[PDB]
Structure formats: structure tokens, C-alpha cells
UniProtKB/Swiss-Prot annotation, chains A, B:
GO terms for molecular function: metal ion binding; tRNA-guanosine(34) queuine transglycosylase activity. It comes from the Bacteria. HAMAP family: Q_tRNA_Tgt. It comes from Zymomonas mobilis subsp. mobilis (strain ATCC 31821 / ZM4 / CP4). This is Queuine tRNA-ribosyltransferase. The keyword Metal-binding applies. Belongs to the queuine tRNA-ribosyltransferase family.
Length: 369, 369
């Protein structure tokens, strides 16, 4: 039987790595893209369809689930895996970003907030909620510093996050069933400042985690600045553990982040923008609602292997999205998630074959033509 | 290869019949339930899922399709079957009911109307639209008399419908490809009046059709009155052709209509009410949004063989519908359509085995317990 957690790097090219995370509930191929399952569903997809696109792991949102249907309720019903019908690994966010984005009174103990009923979220309660959900990869409870941030405020926020990271570690370790069956990732903060990123990486490595997220990015800084911060931030993390870039991103963001040593990604872009009419293609995104697609018999993308591109035309999906039909959301979302997984597969294969630099160049030349 | 049209009755019990309609695109088992595909989609279901529930044929709506995406456009794209990805028979309504329900100036030539742009619908144009869509079963263009109707107005409406039935017949026959590959059904009118129903049946039989619909029912008269009208109306139609009750209905309506000689049904109830939270069960309908289901781990129905009842709980579907999640609509709709098909299968098997009367009694005793 598989271990609780084992990350193995099979091949490297520059800072890029490809390999596997083995966990009780399954193997995760890296670099990995995690479809987002906000309220115990990857929107508009059955779990079997999520798996058919190639996903090895999905992300669940602690903040939404603790409000509806409730963490204790999900536990009483058998846990999130049974509840939604996904039997493979689930990574849960901690709620720290979402509570400040969607709900508040912050203190050293945690955050109290009103639902959008009053609720509480501390490091200890976040880890407990993730236990009740039955998460496989638990995220430490942190604070995502707003951008831009002054050096003083970025430092204060990062320092509190590091104290909360130790509290998260101890809460996780004090629950035997969780410690033996799940993994715990810590989150690097520090805004765009190299010295704070270094202090944060050092604090997290001293505590010790199964994986390390780069937090606090994709919050308005733009790709050039995000890449500049990744350039110095990823090498600060332990090389032998997974590196997770939270909330990223567009296809070109993913490619460049892999070039900088990132192993894991999540984003609502393929699901949310799919429902809004944006389809990803190797020649760049298209908006299927545009009148130019009304009689276009071609599939969404000319090479995509997904079931949507095997059967239905742009013209049909254009009609469905314009009409507000649920099937339009279903088909756009399946295609976009499949596109993301095909991107990850091409990334993994090209690193394994020592041709990822050429892949990145070819990808960009065509995607932005 | 299959014929254009052949209806064969394999078994009978009282007025009930079971058999098959063979058409170019497939075999239809009768009594049959047709899921409704309004705007070129059975809402929230891929065609493969519609087929997996047991459907042999679906209904398409001329009125909606002629407005969006347009009949000529669908023809240019290869027809409705190719467009939506359903390769089996499709019956299309004529637009006569929907134009008066959703859009008007009526005359002997047809109906002119404004979309909800001005448009026209005559017997000739309706048959042409259904040809452009590539319909397998074409409905004559008629007028669904409102209920209640005075005898004079019901007579005038029925008489016009019979003139339009002859125009529909001639338009269909004058298009060689349509006449050779599709079938044409006529629609009996006459409101609740036996003498008008008889005159209408006689006029339709003189013209001659491949099947005969009972129109003008399920328009507010209630089940007792609907059944009373069916009691005398169905025997007036040719015994050796299918009998189609348009727009019906609830499970108990279907059972009683089969007892009165009906072979075909369509209704938005399983799809529309599924999206609204109503699930059909052998113990009657339930509203999954009710708080009593929040922790209910049982499937929607305890015997149902559908994929939804094999995997997901009432509690999960309750959560999805309360949250407004697309997957909730998908799962409710698949279950409800599968329930309807299982009902039709039990009806067919019980007639074939000479035990339909007992089935109807057992069904009602439990469904209304
Ligand atoms: N805990 C964090 O630092 C964090 C969590 C989720 C995020 N999602 C984004 N960006 C998505 C837009 N940036 C994020 C940062
Ligand atoms: N052409 C007709 O006489 C007709 C067509 C569709 C119908 N749909 C209903 N009832 C559904 C409510 N009654 C109907 C009658
Ligand atoms: Cl989403
Ligand atoms: Cl519907
Ligand atoms: Zn595709
Ligand atoms: Zn079911």
C-alpha cells in the first residue's frame, strides 16, 4: 500500500522538475494542476468527468465548506470524499485567504467574521475543519498579505503567518489519525521582498512541512513581478519537497512558474471563465459567444483530445452559451479542464525528455501569435 | 435497413398496447416517454446520458429553434441530429402551441408573431422548418384550443386545424426527401366535446397520417376531465397507428393514459421540476430542498437503477440544489428522466405479461400512500 506521503523527482531541466507524490488515496503526477471544487463540486462536472480529463487531485475550499454544508455535517456524512464522490487526493485550502476576500476582526488568535451568522477561524480550528473534511493535503492557516504592501506591513503579516504555521503544525501533529494519514504544507509569505521571503522560508523549514506553498502572489502584481519574486523565492524552499503556487493561473503563468521550480497549481480560471464563454486553445483563448463562431463547425481546439472536441462544434457551444443552457457550461468546463491537463502532460513529458525549454518557447510562440 | 416507418403491436391488455415503431434512425419502444429538448438540448444532460437513461427518441421544439439558432442555420450546419449530437429519432412539435403560449395575429393563412423581431408560421412554413431541422416525426401545424372553450369556439378552432392538417399533409408529401425519410402525425382537436373529437378523428383519418396525437389536453382541465375525454377520444383514432398524448405528464397521468390507449408521451416535468428540486420516487415525489434531507444518506429512490442513485446521497443533492450548483441540476435531471424511463419499462413489461392492470393498481397504492 502507498505511503502517507512520498515525493520523488524523476527528471529535471534547469529549475523545472517532474515526478510523483504518492499518498494513500492515489498518485499525483507533477507538475500538477488541481481543478477547484469550491462547494464540494468542481462546477458543472461529475467527479468521473474530472478524472477523465486527467486530474489526479482536486482542491476544496475550507471557508465555503465550513459555512455550507458545514464541516461537522460533512464528517457525520462520512467525509468530503464520500460526500462528493471523489475518492482520490483532495488538497484543502485553510480559509485564510477566502475569509479576508469574501467575509471581519483579525487578531493574534485568528479571524472572526460574518458569513456572506458569526464564525471563527484560528490555526487550530482550520486544521480541525480540514480534518473533519478528511483532507489529504492540509494547508497551514496563514494571512495573504494584500498587494501592494509596505515593507513594515508585509513583515508583520509574514511574522504572524509564521507563528500561525507553528500552531498549525502542532495542531496537525496532535491529531494522530490526521498526522498518520494526511500531509501538511506550509505557506511562504513576505510580499515581493526578498529578505522577508528568505525569513519566511527559513521559519517554515525549521518547523518542517511535507510541502511548501508560495503564498501572497497572483494578488494584482502582474506576471513580470510574479516571475521576479519566484526567481528568488522558490530556491529558498527545500528542494526535495513539492512547491505549490497558490491561485495560479493562466497557461503562460503555469509554464513560466514551472521554469522557476513550481510543482503544483490551482486556479478557477478554466472552470469560471469556461462558464463565461472563454475557451482555451493552443492558439490562445477564444470567446465562444463571439458571432464569428455561429457557423464554425470546427471543435473548440483543433488538436485537443477531450470528449467535447471529439463530438461538438464551436457553433453548437456558441448557441448553448448564448442561450444560457447548462450544457454549455458543462461542455466549456470539461474542455477547459482537459486543456489544462493536456498542458500539464506536455510539461511533464517535455521535462522528462529534456526538451522543456523548447516546449516553452514553442508554446509561447503559438499561443501569443 | 429499417423502414421509414412501421408500428407493430406486440401485446395488448384492455385498451393498453405495447410494441415498437421502427424508423431509419432507430427503434422506439412503446409506450414511450420522450424527454424534451427545447433549444437543441435536453437541459443539463449530454445526449449520451439521455440515451443511458433508456430514451429511444427525444422531442425538439420548432418554435424555439426557428428563433434561436434558426432553422436555416441548423440545416446549413448539417441538421439538428448532428448539431446536438443525438443520432436517434427526434419528434418535432409544429410550433402551433408554443407560438400562442410564448409569443400575435392569427388568420386562416397562419400566425404572425413577435419573438420574446417579427416572424411567420403557416402549415407550409412549419413543415419546412421541421424538414430543415431533419425531424424524424413531423407534427402537423394546428391550433391548441384554450380551456375552457365554448362549443362554438372549439368547433371553429378544430375546423381550422383540420384544414391546416390537410395543408400540412400536402406540404410534407410535396418534399420528396421528407416524405421518403420522415413520418407525419396529425393532431386531434375538439376540446372536451365528444362530437367535435369524432369529427376531428374522421377528418384526420380521411387525410391519413402515420400517427395520431390527442391535442388540446393538459391545458388546465384536470386529470378527471382529461381521462373522461381520453375514454371516448382514443377509440376514435385508427387502432393500428401510434397514439400520442401531447404534453402529458405526471407519472399517474401516464399510467392512466396508457390504460386508455396512449402510446407516446412528452413533458417538461422531469427536467424542469428536477432543476427546481422535485425528485420522483416510487413513494411519490419529494422536494430535495427540504431540511429533512440535509443528513439523509439514502439515494433519491430506494430501488432506482440510475447512476445518480448508485453513487450520491439525498444529502449531497440537497446541498447542491440549495447552493445553486449546476451539478445539482445535472443529477436531479438524470435521475428524474431515468425514473420516467423505468416507469415506461415497467408499463411495457407488464402489458407484455398481461399484468398491467395489477401494475397500475400497485403503482398507485404505493405512489399515493
Ligand atoms: N494564502 C495565500 O497566500 C493565497 C491563497 C490563495 C490565493 N489565490 C490567489 N490568487 C488568485 C486570484 N493568490 C492566493 C494566495
Ligand atoms: N397542439 C396541442 O394541442 C398541444 C401541444 C402541446 C401541449 N402541451 C400541453 N400541455 C403541457 C402543459 N398540451 C398541449 C397541446
Ligand atoms: Cl469555478
Ligand atoms: Cl425542461
Ligand atoms: Zn477539447
Ligand atoms: Zn435514480
Amino acid at each position: 500500500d502507498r505511503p502517507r506521503f512520498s515525493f520523488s523527482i524523476a527528471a529535471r531541466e534547469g529549475k523545472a522538475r517532474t515526478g510523483t507524490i504518492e499518498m494513500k488515496r492515489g498518485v499525483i503526477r507533477t507538475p500538477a494542476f488541481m481543478p477547484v471544487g469550491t462547494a464540494a463540486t468542481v462546477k458543472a462536472l461529475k467527479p468521473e468527468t474530472v478524472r477523465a480529463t486527467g486530474a489526479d487531485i482536486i482542491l476544496g475550499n475550507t471557508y465555503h465548506l465550513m459555512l455550507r454544508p458545514g464541516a461537522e455535517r460533512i464528517a457525520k456524512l462520512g467525509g468530503l470524499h464520500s460526500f462528493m464522490g471523489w475518492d482520490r487526493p483532495i488538497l484543502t485550502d485553510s480559509g485564510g485567504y477566502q475569509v479576508m476576500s469574501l467575509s471581519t476582526k483579525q487578531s493574534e488568535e485568528g479571524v472572526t467574521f460574518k458569513s456572506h451568522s458569526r464564525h471563527m477561524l484560528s490555526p487550530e480550528r482550520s486544521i480541525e475543519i480540514q480534518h473533519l473534511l478528511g483532507s489529504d493535503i492540509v494547508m497551514a492557516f496563514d494571512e495573504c498579505t494584500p498587494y501592494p504592501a509596505t515593507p513594515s506591513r508585509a513583515a508583520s503579516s509574514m511574522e504572524r503567518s509564521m507563528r500561525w504555521a507553528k500552531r498549525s503544525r502542532d495542531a496537525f501533529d496532535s491529531r494522530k489519525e490526521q498526522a498518520e494519514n494526511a500531509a501538511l504544507f506550509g505557506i511562504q509569505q513576505g510580499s515581493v521582498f526578498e529578505n522577508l521571503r528568505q525569513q519566511s522560508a527559513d521559519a517554515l523549514a525549521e518547523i518542517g512541512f511535507d510541502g511548501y506553498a508560495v503564498g501572497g502572489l497572483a494578488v494584482g502584481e502582474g506576471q513580470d513581478e510574479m516571475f521576479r519574486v519566484l526567481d528568488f523565492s522558490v530556491p529558498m524552499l527545500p528542494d526535495d519537497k513539492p512547491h505549490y503556487l497558490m491561485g495560479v493561473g493562466k497557461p503562460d503563468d503555469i509554464v513560466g512558474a514551472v521554469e522557476r521550480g513550481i510543482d503544483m497549481f490551482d486556479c478557477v480560471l478554466p472552470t469560471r471563465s469556461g462558464r463565461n464563454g472563454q475557451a482555451f486553445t493552443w492558439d490562445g483563448p477564444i470567446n465562444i459567444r463571439n458571432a464569428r463562431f455561429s457557423e464554425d463547425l470546427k471543435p473548440l481546439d483543433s488538436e485537443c483530445h477531450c470528449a467535447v472536441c471529439q463530438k461538438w462544434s464551436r457553433a453548437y457551444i456558441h448557441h448553448l452559451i448564448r442561450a444560457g443552457e447548462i450544457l454549455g457550461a458543462m461542455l466549456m468546463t470539461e474542455h477547459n479542464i482537459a486543456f489544462y491537463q493536456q498542458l500539464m502532460q506536455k510539461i511533464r513529458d517535455s521535462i522528462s525528455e529534456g526538451r522543456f525549454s523548447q516546449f516553452a518557447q514553442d508554446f509561447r510562440a503559438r499561443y501569443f501569435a
